[PDB]
């Protein structure tokens with residue numbers, strides 16, 4: 411048993427809710443919150459900009475030090491950093507950005523990072539400003555992640571479409 415509340419169960423291990431991931435993280439304080447990161451960990455907009463804003467820019471300060479030491483992530487890759495006031499840890503995962511012409515095939519590799527964590531609160535990778543089809547992202551999530559994932563979908567109309575179209 412865990413404290414995630416109000417989720418619809420899609421499969422044995424995937425759950426979904428219409429929620430703001432920032433507000434969800436603040437309430438639950440999960441062990442792991444996933445950020446929709448880019449390779450530079452520049453948290454300007456989308457989920458990343460919102461998570462970073464909620465940390466009062468501490469996520470960005472930590473991220474800039476990480477990049478200065480280690481260089482950029484790979485598309486499809488991840489790193490574990492602090493969750494600040496939102497979670498114990500933040501798993502920064504880079505899904506492909508279609509608006510940069512990145513290979514959508516890399517979305518499966520991106521979701522594989524979730525399997526290193528038993529339970530996660532996460533957004534749909536490559537959705538939103540990353541330009542992929544969220545229905546496709548949900549399918550890849552369900553077919554790739556084997557650990558317990560709680561998906562927060564900000565947009566109510568999209569949440570309803572994702573549920574109603576789920577196979």
Ligand SMILES: O=C1CC[C@@H](c2ccccc2)N1Nc1ncnc2[nH]c3cc(F)ccc3c12
Nearest residue numbers: 430431446456457460537538539562563564565
């Ligand atoms: O609704 C959806 C489906 C796709 C996904 C997404 C992913 C990367 C970039 C943009 C959008 N996304 N966005 C969110 N998902 C969950 N909680 C969120 N809190 C936010 C607060 C904000 F200021 C802006 C957006 C979100 C948000």
